[PDB]
Amino acid sequence: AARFQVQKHSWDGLRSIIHGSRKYSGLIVNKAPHDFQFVQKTDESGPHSHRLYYLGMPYGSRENSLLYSEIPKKVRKEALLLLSWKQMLDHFQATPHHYSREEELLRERKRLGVFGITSYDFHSESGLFLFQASNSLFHCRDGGKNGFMVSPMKPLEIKTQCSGPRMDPKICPADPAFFSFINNSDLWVANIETGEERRLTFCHQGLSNVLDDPKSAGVATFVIQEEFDRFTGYWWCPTASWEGSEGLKTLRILYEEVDESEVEVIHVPSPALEERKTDSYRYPRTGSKNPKIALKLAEFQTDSQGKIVSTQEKELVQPFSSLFPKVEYIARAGWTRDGKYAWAMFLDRPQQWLQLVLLPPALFIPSTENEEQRLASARAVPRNVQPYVVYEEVTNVWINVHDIFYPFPQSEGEDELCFLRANECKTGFCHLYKVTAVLKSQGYDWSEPFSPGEDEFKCPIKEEIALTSGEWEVLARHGSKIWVNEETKLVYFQGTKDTPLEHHLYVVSYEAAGEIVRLTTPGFSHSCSMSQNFDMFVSHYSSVSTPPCVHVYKLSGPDDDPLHKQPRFWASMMEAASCPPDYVPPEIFHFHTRSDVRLYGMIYKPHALQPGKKHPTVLFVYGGPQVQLVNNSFKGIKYLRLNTLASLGYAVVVIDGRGSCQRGLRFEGALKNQMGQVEIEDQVEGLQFVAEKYGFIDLSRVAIHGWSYGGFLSLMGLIHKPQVFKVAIAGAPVTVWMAYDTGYTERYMDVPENNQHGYEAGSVALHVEKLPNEPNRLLILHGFLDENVHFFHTNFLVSQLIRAGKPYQLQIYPNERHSIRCPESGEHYEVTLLHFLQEYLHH
Amino acid sequence: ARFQVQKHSWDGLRSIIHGSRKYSGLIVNKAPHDFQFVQKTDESGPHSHRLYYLGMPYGSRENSLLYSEIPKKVRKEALLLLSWKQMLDHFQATPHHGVYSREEELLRERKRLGVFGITSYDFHSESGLFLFQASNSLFHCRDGGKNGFMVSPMKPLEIKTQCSGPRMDPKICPADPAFFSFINNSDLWVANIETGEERRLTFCHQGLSNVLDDPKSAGVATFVIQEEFDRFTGYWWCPTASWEGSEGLKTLRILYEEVDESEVEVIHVPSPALEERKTDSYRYPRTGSKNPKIALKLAEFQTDSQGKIVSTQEKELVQPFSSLFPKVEYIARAGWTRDGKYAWAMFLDRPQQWLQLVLLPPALFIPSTENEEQRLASARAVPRNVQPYVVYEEVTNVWINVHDIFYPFPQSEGEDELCFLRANECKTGFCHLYKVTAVLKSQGYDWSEPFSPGEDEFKCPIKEEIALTSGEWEVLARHGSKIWVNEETKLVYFQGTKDTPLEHHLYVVSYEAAGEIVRLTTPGFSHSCSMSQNFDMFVSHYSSVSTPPCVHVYKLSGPDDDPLHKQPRFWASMMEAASCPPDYVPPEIFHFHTRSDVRLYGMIYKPHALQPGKKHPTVLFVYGGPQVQLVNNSFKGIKYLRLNTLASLGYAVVVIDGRGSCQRGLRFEGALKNQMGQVEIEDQVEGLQFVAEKYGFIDLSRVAIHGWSYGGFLSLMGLIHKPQVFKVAIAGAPVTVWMAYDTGYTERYMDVPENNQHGYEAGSVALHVEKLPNEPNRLLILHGFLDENVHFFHTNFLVSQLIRAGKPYQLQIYPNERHSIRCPESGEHYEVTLLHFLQEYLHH
Ligand SMILES: *C(=O)C(CC)(CC)C(=O)Nc1cccc(CN2CCN(Cc3cccc4cccnc34)CC2)c1
Ligand SMILES: *C(=O)C(CC)(CC)C(=O)Nc1cccc(CN2CCN(Cc3cccc4cccnc34)CC2)c1
Structure with a gap:
């Protein structure tokens, strides 16, 4: 019946209410550990099964650092183990004084509020860690051959003769002596052991007028970062090859080359307000030109001593725009685990048509100004070498880019590719499918100019099995992923199967598709990280009534019934704060x-x-x-x-x-x-x-x-x-x-x-x-x-x-x-x- | 007790404000301005003068070039309202959607110009040539002189160009009205209006794609000069031709400021096309930081009897500007003596507490060259008796206000001295008119030898300095105020606060026998006046707190033997006061x-x-x-x-x-x-x-x-x-x-x-x-x-x-x-x- 009246406070009264609400919150912002890596320990005498690496803000620090916890082989059932956060790095200030425009904009695009180390690359076999810190590149080693530290080591800086920041660093999977980075809109490699650095791409002239210098290699542009959640423009080939009788090893990087020449320029004020200047952005407003794009291949050869002998820029035998004329965006790219194919997820401009395309390295030839040398290279490309469109998604609504694409290893002389794919447009709900594409050869003359017909490169689908179905979703975007155990033929995924109000961890067979097992506790929404050995997982979970906790779970039970492995609470990385x-x-x-x-x-x-x-x-x-x-x-x-x-x-x-x-x-x-x-x-x-x-x-x-x-x-x-x-x-x-x-x-x-x-x-x-x-x-x-x-x-x-x-x-x-x-x-x-x-x- | 204002709805307040502003939109930018009096030389015709001006008559949405006919006789018991005649036949001076180029837009902001259409014109009386900007281009028309006076609106002829981008700050050559100058892409150009020949005189702007690597300009007033010193030009025509060529060639000269903004801080300001989401770059000298590096230079070109441009030459001071004038931070003002014998400049130090008026003979400028041997030969050839002359110096512990009044008399006493009228505020702490005579005595200089000038280098002895005005009131010398000098009668007309600081009045005083100051304007109003160059008539734009502005034409009448006591007689109205x-x-x-x-x-x-x-x-x-x-x-x-x-x-x-x-x-x-x-x-x-x-x-x-x-x-x-x-x-x-x-x-x-x-x-x-x-x-x-x-x-x-x-x-x-x-x-x-x-x- 009656109207409640809010108490009218003075402005300073409202300031005290707001300041009090935050200062005496009883909750701390961004305290959760994240970016988890499980490594098994191989000392039978020792008390620990695993070391768990992660990023977090340890006690008495104001910045994220590289941390580890020891996972014990046995825990008391009637007691709560809170794992101690051990520092990897000795008293080290990762944050700069009081970041560059490049690092500042990247933190804005990745929605990163915390200071210090915000990501690391890790090579499990060698135990190498690589990360940005103190406006430079640092590395350290733990596990593998070297064995496990018992106290914080000092991180070794990687010296450079490069001018300006070294962005998006990544370890070479085939040989962890090598890493890559972007410097001034071009792709570089370096040998971390010898300190040799080598520029691979020459797109960026470094001209005084930046707007006359519109090409980049290895870089995700504004719309790709802001609207497609992709922060890299290059992908290591996971394997080495051994061409030529000189005993040289070839390493490969797929990269996106972009030309922003025709993209509209806008000015946004720079954060140094007192300088009264703006930064220039290539901002494609709706209806205007997106960047001109192509996929290219950077190759370099190394000797047994790890010296970089030669480098080569390679490009598709016919232009990207000729082979793939309806492609507006590259959503995603990568390699098959054997390095046999590069792959790309291509979108049309309306974003109603997606293609997953395999690109063999043999389709790429040396870049040259010499038209005669280019024709010789194109003449040498075999007729049996071609792109393969292994999957196509079409809708009258829109394609949401789903990050789930898992290609299985092929047999020798096998003309089919089996893969797991998240697909929403088929049923209108995002679901997991096991797909078998047949890599159909048509025969192509690559020396002639190319005009693709309808369904050019389109692979027959021999089989497409729904692993999941119903009016609920597999989570496939904005950090959500699958984990595939090829030993047990199981795929672990997150979804809304129990309720659209909660994310849960599930497992199903991709061999004998049937029962979906839930691995997380109802009444909470879960964000999970699975060990690559499928023995342990982390869940970051909360409810409306309970602040977030981070718990480690052991998957336990008979190895002959892997689908019904039981999640057992093992230890806590972080207890829920009091509500x-x-x-x-x-x-x-x-x-x-x-x-x-x-x-x-x-x-x-x-x-x-x-x-x-x-x-x-x-x-x-x-x-x-x-x-x-x-x-x-x-x-x-x-x-x-x-x-x-x-x-x-x-x-x-x-x-x-x-x-x-x-x-x-x-x-x-x-x-x-x-x-x-x-x-x-x-x-x-x-x-x-x-x-x-x-x-x-x-x-x-x-x-x-x-x-x-x-x-x-x-x-x-x-x-x-x-x-x-x-x-x-x-x-x-x-x-x-x-x-x-x-x-x-x-x-x-x-x-x-x-x-x-x-x-x-x-x-x-x-x-x-x-x-x-x-x-x-x-x-x-x-x-x-x-x-x-x-x-x-x-x-x-x-x-x-x-x-x-x-x-x-x-x-x-x-x-x-x-x-x-x-x-x-x-x-x-x-x-x-x-x-x-x-x-x-x-x- | 406390009065309470009536509370209105937002739409109530909109109605009150919208209603109020109908009156302001009836009277704002209604006044005619930029007056030129021309005498008529026809005894049979009924008009003594034609009066040219800019105006927006009622109905027009832009300022245009207008004229009115001034009759020889008027009824004493009748108020004559002069008819406003159009000069231009159905001509849109304003560009599409009133969207000016950045150069024209910024100049209108800095000159506080609210009206659309023609906002200024250059006029050459002998030739009857009018020159003006319109429709993001340059136009001209002719009236009076040899051609005779139009009776109906003529069409303005566009001036064709092969220049890319705007032609700014156009000016008629006083010595030869066949020629005009303009700035294009930060360089000085001249063109022959009759033949259509165009010629670039200065080569400061490389035209680089990175504009910040292209920091030099010629003929341009930079940001602080326009915004804070009220100067909108960086070049000055020599008023005379010379004939030092033995092929019978005529030489024409332009003095110009060259600037280098390399070290000046850059700021970005949003552009008025909001939807483009871009800024313009400005060389903005913030307090304590670097101003532009400046120099005065001389552009020369030679013309034949047929008016063809035969040759051009860039000339610079025999020693660098920074060597000759090491304490100069700003060029406030510059120009020439009426005979073209000397260029002059008004120089300020960085604290703006020290001003110098300096003569610069053209002989002190030598051809620009990379060849050091040619430069030394040129420097050696400069006569020893050629030098700068500091004819006046103003110093203060407050600050120098730049006064626009400097009137150099022709050297009718001989070449050893220069007489000039100067406004000076720092002497008594009130701005007053002084008649000054400086002695121009050559020290003798070897200009090929380097020299760092000492204190008071080039400082002229002052033979005479007479106060023409004095007291606790001001001669107005800034922001549009000027003097008019009649050398026949030895009288100087000026505006001042002598009667009251609340009113501007027109006054006249003798510069020969300085004594009685006569007021020409009616007390109880503040007046803004334009004097005929023949001193027979003047216009006053005037108002009071209670009376909206009117524009009246007055005749100066009475015995010719007593010019100081000429009576201002109301002649006609250009604009009557609106009803309040x-x-x-x-x-x-x-x-x-x-x-x-x-x-x-x-x-x-x-x-x-x-x-x-x-x-x-x-x-x-x-x-x-x-x-x-x-x-x-x-x-x-x-x-x-x-x-x-x-x-x-x-x-x-x-x-x-x-x-x-x-x-x-x-x-x-x-x-x-x-x-x-x-x-x-x-x-x-x-x-x-x-x-x-x-x-x-x-x-x-x-x-x-x-x-x-x-x-x-x-x-x-x-x-x-x-x-x-x-x-x-x-x-x-x-x-x-x-x-x-x-x-x-x-x-x-x-x-x-x-x-x-x-x-x-x-x-x-x-x-x-x-x-x-x-x-x-x-x-x-x-x-x-x-x-x-x-x-x-x-x-x-x-x-x-x-x-x-x-x-x-x-x-x-x-x-x-x-x-x-x-x-x-x-x-x-x-x-x-x-x-x-x-x-x-x-x-x-
Ligand atoms: C404003 O609404 C705009 C502009 C900023 C569009 C007008 C906008 O929101 N754009 C937009 C672009 C890309 C992606 C999104 C949606 N993401 C927002 C951030 N979010 C992170 C996140 C939030 C809550 C919970 C949670 C849990 C796990 C992982 N991430 C999150 C992802 C979706 C919006
Ligand atoms: C604001 O106050 C600033 C910045 C815009 C300083 C912080 C400012 O006003 N600057 C400024 C710079 C140079 C010159 C002036 C003073 N002029 C302003 C325009 N004014 C024209 C004018 C106005 C009213 C009456 C009148 C009568 C005759 C002639 N002109 C005028 C001239 C003075 C201010």
């Missing part, structure tokens, strides 16, 4: 829309709730593709401010409407070509359901708040439902889809020329006449340095608001990119949110 | 004496329909910076209608010209030296407290402070230093960190940062955010995103500091505006926002 007394978990619910679609939501109930009270409500919204807000995992680290709102007496509602992920392609596909037009309808149905079910929602006092897609929908809510939403707080909103990039926008909306109606309807800056004529209903927030949702979106929205004579409030975070990382900015944002709601969320 | 709206109430000017016994002027907009015993919420509208006077007897309804609008809603509006403001002498302006922020607020608070005591209707518990640029800076300073005086601040385009501002402005008033760490720290509001309010809705920041003078950086940095100090703030940005709000939608939104912020938050 704070001031923190009240949200409650997950579900409802059916008027169209009988099931939606999940969660509610943060006003704290110390009294009956007969209607409370002012904040609808917290993301609502975009590739994200699920509502699941059974701990929200108090990333979304503490929602608990803070509930503590002051706001109800907080979160709805996963149509367009959100982990519900299949059809569910996500509801927003195709009509972003903005359907998401608000589901949000309002959720709000009305929560009001009817729970009874404490004041529908006369609803705020809408979100960031990025959530900022976009906050403005759309005020435009389409001005009687529902009293106020909107729009953080980093997309306001004009024509200003957003190719990779994201075209996937969901097509190009502007093909979807004028959708682009117009979905661009909030073109509908400012429908925004409120009353002041204090709209707050816009934006990081000045945002390289994803450019400040331009807010600038253009403001320009339109002025033209339409509409009021607005604005806050800028001058030192922030897309997400607020600095504590002062984060606190100021939260204080501003509390102040805006207390002053302006009224009936 | 009924709800426009003029502000009231007052003065008061500070506790230190300094007289300060202010004005008050009284709340409309004021009732006694009521205290009203108050807006202190502030600029408070150097080079500006807000309080004078001129019409404020064009630029400051919004102050009347505030008064109509029941706000009191107060304006105080504190110490630091101009038109009160160097000592008064000098009060803020090395301590910007620290004295201006004290005077603002004394003014406010005086107005509250004198007028009795000021609620001192409800005062807002509001200003733009220096006024934005002082709005923040008021909130920091006087938080109990100012309930709210609205800070527009504030300077928040003086260390981020430029060399020319900041060093003049504040020295370099290393010499004035205390003053820079105390005056930088972004470094004192801890003292800004912990209560919301006391601070509104406004800034144009594209501001190329007060960079958005100032607001961005202030916000970054406010966040770190945990302070609340409100922010509005004008994404499509540079420094000043030019778009009507932006202007309306600003004024609506101002009224909303005051109605909601100016309380208690």
Whole structure:
């Protein structure tokens, strides 16, 4: 019956509430160990079965370092073993003073907040570790022949004569004496033992005008990093070969060569604000030119002493653009484990057609200006050498790039490739298939200019067995992977089989496809890392009510029944923090829309709730593709401010409407070509359901708040439902889809020329006449340095608001990119949110 | 008791502001300007003169070239309104969507030009040639002279070019109007307008793809020169031809500034095409950092009797500019003597406390060459009696204000001396006219021998220095003000504050027998005048606080034997004063004496329909910076209608010209030296407290402070230093960190940062955010995103500091505006926002 009134605090009152909420949280940000490597110990006398390597922030450190824990052979059943974190590196400052533009932008794109060592490459046979640290390259050795340290060793720096940063370092799998890196947009190798360095590619001239120097080798460009989650542009061949009678060893690297010549240039302000300068970006806006791309092959020869004797740039016998004319993007690439084939995952520009293509090294010839030498090379390419399209995925929705492709070893003289593949477009749910392609030879004259027909290189599919099926998903994106045991014929995977609210670890046979066994405990969402010996796994898991823990599990039982190996709790890497007394978990619910679609939501109930009270409500919204807000995992680290709102007496509602992920392609596909037009309808149905079910929602006092897609929908809510939403707080909103990039926008909306109606309807800056004529209903927030949702979106929205004579409030975070990382900015944002709601969320 | 302003809806405030601004859009940029008088030489015709000018008549959406006919006789008992005749037949001078090239766009911003169309023209009276920019190209037309006077609009002929990109700063050759000059891609060109021959004279710009590796320009005024020294050209035609060639060839000369910006810091400012998401690069000398390396050079070319360009030559000083003039940081001004015998330059040191006027004979310049032997031969051939002459030197412990008045007389006494009129402020601390005679005595120099000049090298003996004016008032010599000299009558016409600092008047004094100064303009108005070169007629553009501007033509009439006492007789009107709206109430000017016994002027907009015993919420509208006077007897309804609008809603509006403001002498302006922020607020608070005591209707518990640029800076300073005086601040385009501002402005008033760490720290509001309010809705920041003078950086940095100090703030940005709000939608939104912020938050 009655309306609850939030206590109005002074600004300094709100500062103390926010500072207190964070400072006395009873939770620490990014404390979990990660990037796990299991190594077996081979001392029968010793007490430890394994050493476990990982990245983590040890006790009395402010930065990530390389750590190990000892896994004992036996544990007391009636006792909880907390593994001690041992340092690998002796008192070593990995972080630079107070990063370069290259390292800074990479941390923004990989969503990395923590300081210090953020990744390492590891070679198990040799026990070599390789990593970036102190704006240089370092390495150390542990296990293998050398044996296991019992105290922190000092990491050996790798000296260079190169100018500028050495990026994306990787150990050569065939010979760990060698590693690769990118320097000034070109691929280099070095011998880590001898210290010899050698440039392999010569794309980057190093010209004074950078915009006249538009080619790179081995580099993932802006859209590939930001929209396709690929951070490398080169891949070591896993094997050596032995061509020529001189006894030389050949090592190979597949790399993407890019030319950004025709790609539009935008300027984004640089983080040194006092310098009043911008950085230049090759930013493909929707409908404009993406980079020109090709796959190429770098080869070098080595003697028995490890000297680099010769190097060669090799390219496809006919141009990439001739062989693969419909390919806009290379999503992924790699090699078969025998090095027999390079492979690439190719996408068309509409992102409705994917090909998995094998490329034999024999299809690549030496790069040359000499047309006669090139023709001699092309004449020598055998007729039986060709690309093989071993898999093709087609959809009328869009291809989500799935990272799961596992090719099995071939027999000698076998013209088939068996592989595991995650495929969503077949059933509309991402599932594991065992595929057998026949490598069909047509015979090709590579000396003639090439024009591929329909189904050029297309391999017959002899067999395609569903290992999984149903209205749930195998997780195949954004870090999710499979692990394959070829001894037991088992594939381990993560999925939503038990519930869309929880990630679980599962195992199924790929030989006798049948029973799926769950390996993780229901009531938690799990993120797992499996030992390459399939004897142990780590689970990073949480629930809405329980902060995250990291536990080590032993897979135990008879070796003759590997599918039914039992997960046994073994030891803890990190115990769950106490759920704070001031923190009240949200409650997950579900409802059916008027169209009988099931939606999940969660509610943060006003704290110390009294009956007969209607409370002012904040609808917290993301609502975009590739994200699920509502699941059974701990929200108090990333979304503490929602608990803070509930503590002051706001109800907080979160709805996963149509367009959100982990519900299949059809569910996500509801927003195709009509972003903005359907998401608000589901949000309002959720709000009305929560009001009817729970009874404490004041529908006369609803705020809408979100960031990025959530900022976009906050403005759309005020435009389409001005009687529902009293106020909107729009953080980093997309306001004009024509200003957003190719990779994201075209996937969901097509190009502007093909979807004028959708682009117009979905661009909030073109509908400012429908925004409120009353002041204090709209707050816009934006990081000045945002390289994803450019400040331009807010600038253009403001320009339109002025033209339409509409009021607005604005806050800028001058030192922030897309997400607020600095504590002062984060606190100021939260204080501003509390102040805006207390002053302006009224009936 | 407390008056409460009526609370309106946002759309209510939009209606009030939209209604108010109909009047301003009727009168703003309506005045004709850039006047040229030409006498008619036809006794049969009814007109004594044709008067050319720029104007936007009612209906037109752009400025065009116009003329009016001045009749020989007028009815004494009738007011003649002159007809505005078009020169150009249905011609769009404005480009498509009013989108100018970056060069033309930035020049309009720096010259404060609001109108579209033709904004300037070059005129050659003998030939009747007009030359002007239009439609991102160059045009010309002819009228008067040999050709005779048009009776209907002619079509302007475009000048064809093979040059790529804009042709900037076009000028007619005074010696030969067949030739004109222009700048193309940072180099000086000349062209023959009759033949169409074009020739590049300078080769500073390599045209490299990396622009930052291409840092030299010729003929160009750089960023600080345009923004802070009010100079928009970097070259000067020699007014005469010479004939030193024995093939009967004619030599024409151009003096030009060559600059090297190699060492100057680079900043990026967003470009006005927001959707392109790009910036333009600027060579921005921040205070304490490097200015451009500069030199004066000489471009020569030879022409035959048929007007063909036979040859060209780049010439430079026989010893480097940096050797001859080692303490010179800036070229303020340059030109020639009327006979072309000497180039001259006005040089400033880096502290801007030492100015030199220097003659440079063309003989001191030798051909540019890489060949060291040829250079030494050239240097040896320079006569020993050729040298620079420092004819005048101004020194001060305050600062040099660059005065545009330097009038060299022809050398009618002989070659040993130069007589000149000069405006000088540092001598008495008030800007006054002096007649100076310098002695030009050759020391004898071997120019092939290197020499480092000592103190007072080239310094001329001063034979005579007569004060033509004196007292505690100013001759106006800056920002458009000039003198006119009639050498027949020995009279100099000037504008000044002799009658009152509140009014500009036209005056005349003899430079032969300096004595009585005669005022030619009517008291009770401030006048802006244009004098005929024949001294028979003048125009006055004039207004008062109560009367909108009019433009009247006056005849100077009376006996020719007594020219000093010629009567100004009203002849005709170019523009009558508009009717004021009924709800426009003029502000009231007052003065008061500070506790230190300094007289300060202010004005008050009284709340409309004021009732006694009521205290009203108050807006202190502030600029408070150097080079500006807000309080004078001129019409404020064009630029400051919004102050009347505030008064109509029941706000009191107060304006105080504190110490630091101009038109009160160097000592008064000098009060803020090395301590910007620290004295201006004290005077603002004394003014406010005086107005509250004198007028009795000021609620001192409800005062807002509001200003733009220096006024934005002082709005923040008021909130920091006087938080109990100012309930709210609205800070527009504030300077928040003086260390981020430029060399020319900041060093003049504040020295370099290393010499004035205390003053820079105390005056930088972004470094004192801890003292800004912990209560919301006391601070509104406004800034144009594209501001190329007060960079958005100032607001961005202030916000970054406010966040770190945990302070609340409100922010509005004008994404499509540079420094000043030019778009009507932006202007309306600003004024609506101002009224909303005051109605909601100016309380208690
Ligand atoms: C704003 O909404 C934009 C721009 C930044 C689009 C307008 C946006 O969000 N774009 C976008 C691009 C690529 C991928 C995504 C979705 N990812 C967001 C980050 N997320 C990491 C993550 C979050 C929660 C839990 C979790 C658990 C395991 C691994 N990762 C995560 C992955 C999805 C959005
Ligand atoms: C802001 O205050 C800054 C930055 C834009 C300094 C922080 C500023 O104002 N700078 C500045 C630089 C050079 C010269 C000036 C002073 N001029 C301003 C324009 N003004 C034209 C003018 C205005 C009103 C009346 C009037 C009457 C006759 C002639 N001109 C004018 C001339 C002075 C400021």
